Design an enzyme around this catalytic site. Structure first.
Site, short mmCIF file in Angstrom:
data_model
loop_
_atom_site.label_atom_id
_atom_site.label_comp_id
_atom_site.label_asym_id
_atom_site.label_seq_id
_atom_site.Cartn_x
_atom_site.Cartn_y
_atom_site.Cartn_z
N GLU A 143 27.07 27.82 27.70
CA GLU A 143 27.52 29.22 27.58
C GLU A 143 27.80 29.82 26.20
O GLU A 143 28.89 30.32 25.95
CB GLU A 143 28.70 29.45 28.51
CG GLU A 143 28.28 29.52 29.95
CD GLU A 143 29.40 29.93 30.89
OE1 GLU A 143 30.56 30.00 30.43
OE2 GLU A 143 29.13 30.18 32.11
N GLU A 255 24.83 26.83 36.37
CA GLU A 255 26.17 27.19 36.81
C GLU A 255 26.09 28.40 37.75
O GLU A 255 25.53 29.44 37.39
CB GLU A 255 27.07 27.50 35.61
CG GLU A 255 28.11 26.44 35.29
CD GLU A 255 29.05 26.83 34.15
OE1 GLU A 255 29.69 27.91 34.21
OE2 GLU A 255 29.16 26.05 33.16
O1 LIG Z 1 30.40 34.11 33.47
C1 LIG Z 1 30.57 32.76 33.03
C2 LIG Z 1 31.82 32.59 32.17
O2 LIG Z 1 32.31 33.93 31.97
C3 LIG Z 1 33.56 34.11 31.29
O3 LIG Z 1 33.97 35.48 31.50
C4 LIG Z 1 33.33 36.55 30.78
C5 LIG Z 1 32.09 37.05 31.56
O4 LIG Z 1 30.97 36.15 31.38
C6 LIG Z 1 31.69 38.49 31.16
O5 LIG Z 1 30.64 38.97 32.00
C7 LIG Z 1 32.90 39.42 31.24
O6 LIG Z 1 32.53 40.78 30.98
O7 LIG Z 1 33.86 38.99 30.27
C8 LIG Z 1 34.38 37.67 30.51
C9 LIG Z 1 35.26 37.35 29.30
O8 LIG Z 1 35.99 38.54 28.96
C10 LIG Z 1 34.65 33.14 31.82
O9 LIG Z 1 35.71 33.06 30.86
C11 LIG Z 1 34.17 31.70 32.11
O10 LIG Z 1 35.09 30.97 32.95
C12 LIG Z 1 32.84 31.66 32.84
O11 LIG Z 1 32.47 30.26 32.92
#
Ligand SMILES: OC[C@H]1O[C@@H](O[C@H]2[C@H](O)[C@@H](O)[C@H](O)O[C@@H]2CO)[C@H](O)[C@@H](O)[C@@H]1O
Length: 324
Positions: A143, A255
């Protein structure tokens, strides 16, 4: 259709989204090391459910005991290899996923943080363990997000690939991650695909270099909500496959998941049905989160062992298990 698996988490605990891995907080999901029966979990996921591969998150810091380089710390590695050995002993393929968000303590590889070489070194060593073994699948980086220049990132990934092949890992898949938490929705639109399309093995081929993508079913793509609101076909998997097909390239969804509830059983089954339909461009899905998450974990997939008899979570048995 080629692969279906689950993430067996624990070594990634106290890994932050900023690349800081409180390497105290690492918690191996193995009976021994005083964690859950990850090995048994895997016996079951194969023998009863038809799973195929497991993804084994671990942090750079754990591998090296705190250092950005490739000097593998033997005691820690012994722990982590035992999980990989359990994954292989269960009859499945194993993704060795460095769970660092393209960072090392706040700083970005190739772009502020450790250099492409510091990083490449790491992968040489990992690859050197495991080179001959073709059931291994090297997950370069988990990621990447908020990276300012994707082509420099694709350069960092080249460096790892080259390190990996040169240690003899000639037969394995290598997963290539891009930006926005490798969201599958933006993978092409933000440049991740075109940059990473340039990455090649030493001989000039793309053989066995597969894009690495992630996708959750909640409104904000976080995978923090129990309830699901979509199947990502319209906005993610459709566009993605079109792109993937005409370019002669494949991706792998390492994932995904959702809560153990109605809305998610309907929407996830939809996404998995679509993914199988496009087995030419998608190599598989891997569901996020078994290993040693507690039961009430929102994205939980940990099954239960009652004197030999295992029982899955709702979402695994309704949707994610190939045997359903
Ligand atoms: O989506 C996987 C990953 O995402 C993390 O959250 C992010 C997200 O991807 C994004 O679309 C959104 O707008 O913001 C958040 C962060 O602000 C998350 O922290 C992880 O647990 C997850 O594995």
């Amino acid at each position: 259709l080629q692969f279906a698996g689950v993430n067996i988490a624990g070594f990634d605990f106290g890994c932050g989204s900023d690349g800081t891995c409180n390497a105290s907080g690492a918690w191996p999901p193995l009976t021994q090391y005083y964690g859950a029966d990850g090995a048994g979990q895997m016996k079951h996921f194969v023998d009863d459910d038809g799973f195929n591969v497991f993804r084994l998150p671990v942090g750079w810091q754990f591998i090296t005991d705190g250092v950005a380089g490739g000097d593998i710390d033997e005691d820690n590695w012994a722990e982590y290899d035992a999980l990989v050995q359990a994954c292989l002993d269960a009859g499945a393929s194993c993704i060795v996923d460095v769970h660092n968000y393209a960072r090392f303590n706040g700083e970005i590889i190739g772009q502020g943080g450790p250099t492409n070489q510091d990083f490449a070194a790491l992968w040489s060593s990992i690859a050197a363990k495991y080179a001959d073994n073709d059931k291994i699948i090297f997950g370069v980086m988990n990621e990447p997000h908020d990276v300012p220049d994707i082509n420099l990132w694709a350069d960092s990934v080249q460096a790892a690939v080259t390190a990996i092949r040169q240690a003899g890992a000639t037969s394995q898949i290598i997963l290539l991650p891009g930006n926005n938490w490798t969201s599958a929705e933006t993978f092409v639109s933000n440049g991740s695909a075109d940059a990473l399309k340039k990455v090649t093995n030493p001989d000039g081929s793309v053989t066995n270099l597969i894009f690495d993508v992630h996708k959750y079913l909640d409104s904000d793509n976080s995978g923090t909500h129990e309830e699901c609101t979509t199947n990502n076909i319209d906005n993610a998997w459709a566009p993605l496959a079109e792109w993937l097909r005409c370019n002669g390239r494949q991706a792998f969804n390492t994932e995904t998941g959702g809560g153990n509830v109605a809305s998610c059983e309907t929407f996830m089954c939809q996404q998995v049905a679509y993914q199988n339909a496009n087995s030419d461009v998608f190599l598989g899905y891997v569901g996020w989160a078994a290993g040693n998450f507690y039961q009430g974990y929102v994205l939980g997939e940990v099954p239960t062992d009652t004197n030999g008899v295992w029982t899955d979570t709702a979402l695994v048995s309704a949707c994610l298990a190939p045997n359903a």
